């Protein structure tokens, strides 16, 4: 449990969940200025999804409250003037207190993952998640996923990482992934991911 | 049933369907230049949804093939340098052959709407009005004004009914794009009804 003052990168149509390392294309000037503060300092940064992908310059009201604390590990330039930035999402963050300035900066609380005392149900849910995800991948039609990613999921045995990684790979809406991010209770989080997977499997099987 | 060369406006996260008049916020320079060509000419324009909302400078491959032919009705220069444009979409368009230039321009074929098996269509229409009333009743997120819902209930044109419901529903771009691309009327009505019934099951699930 920490409190950090970090620059904030708004994500138009993406939710980053902890335990994921992903490249983020960064086109907007204010997002770029947030990246260079991070790289010039401790490389810590907040990533927060927008409520509306079409908003060009989001204010605090345009952003969800919860995001992730991430590490900026390296940045690259592309033929375009955008920056591809590799980010390591570490933990959920409640990003509340935005500070006036030329770009988005805020103080937020970074949250530990609390393991429930009902470990037995969680262990069953973990096995139900891996089974449901394997069928989701087998019966999905538009899903991009490499073999090594699929074996990582099946080899993960922590529930918190398993839920977060599955939610990252699945093709759910921002609002649906945002709710996974905001469910701190682990068994409720596992049951939401499983409900969404079963829902899509039902829909896949009809056709 | 004509082929026209018009400027094209890419939409990041919106699908426009015929029979709708909607505001379009226009931030990108190429989108702004495409609007003013329309305003300086016959005010006709193509609106095409992007496949990926995060793409800043879409190429033809970044766009769906089908869009709408619309009339630019008014433009509001906003303080942040954006253009709010009111557009009335009037017909489906297959936007195929994009033209070299500083912004998106393309030739596309505009398709008029022509009621098949009137017996099934009538059943689907009545089933649609009922499902929509409950969809509106059992969502939890949707903002519809009274005049809009009574417009739905009084409409007896099937094409207008399907397109208007798809406009109001909170479905993804890909799902609404599928409504746009179903030119055969009975298949379109059966898709809209399936999506509403699908959502009705999930709403009562809680």
Author numbering:
A (entry chain A): 0 to 206
B (entry chain B): 0 to 113, 115 to 206
Lines quoted from the article behind this entry:
Collectively, our results showed that the NTD of LonA selectively interacts with protein substrates via critical hydrophobic residues of its N-lobe, demonstrating that the NTD enables LonA to perform protein quality control by selectively interacting with proteins in damaged or unfolded states.
We obtained crystals of the N-terminal fragment NN206 of MtaLonA by in situ proteolysis during crystallization. The structure was refined to 2.1 Å resolution with a free R factor of 24.9% (crystallographic R factor is 20.9%). NN206 forms a bilobal fold: (1) the N-terminal lobe, which consists of one α-helix and six β-strands, forming three β-sheets (β1/β3/β4/β5, β2/β5/β4, and β1/β6/β5); (2) the C-terminal lobe, which is exclusively α-helical, consisting of a five-helix bundle. The two lobes are jointed together by an 18-residue linker, which is similar to that of both EcLon and MacLon. We further applied multidimensional heteronuclear NMR experiments to assign the observed cross-peaks in 1H–15N TROSY-HSQC spectrum of NN206 (BMRB code: 50697) and the NMR-derived secondary structure of NN206, based on the Chemical Shift Index, was highly similar to its solved X-ray structures. NMR analysis indicates that thermally damaged Ig2 induces significant CSPs and broadened resonances in the NTD N-lobe, which comprises one α-helix and three β-sheets β1/β3/β4/β5, β2/β5/β4 and β1/β6/β5. The residues of MtaLonA NTD with the pronounced CSPs are part of the interaction interface located mainly at helix α1, loop L1, L2, L3, and β-sheet β2/β5/β4, which consist primarily of hydrophobic residues and are decorated by a number of polar residues. By analyzing the NTD of MtaLonA interactions with damaged Ig2, the scrambled lysozyme, and Sul20 peptide, we conclude that these binding events are mediated by two hydrophobic patches, which comprise (1) L10, V14, I15, P22, V23, and M85 (termed hpI in the following); (2) M75, L77, P78, and L82 (termed hpII).
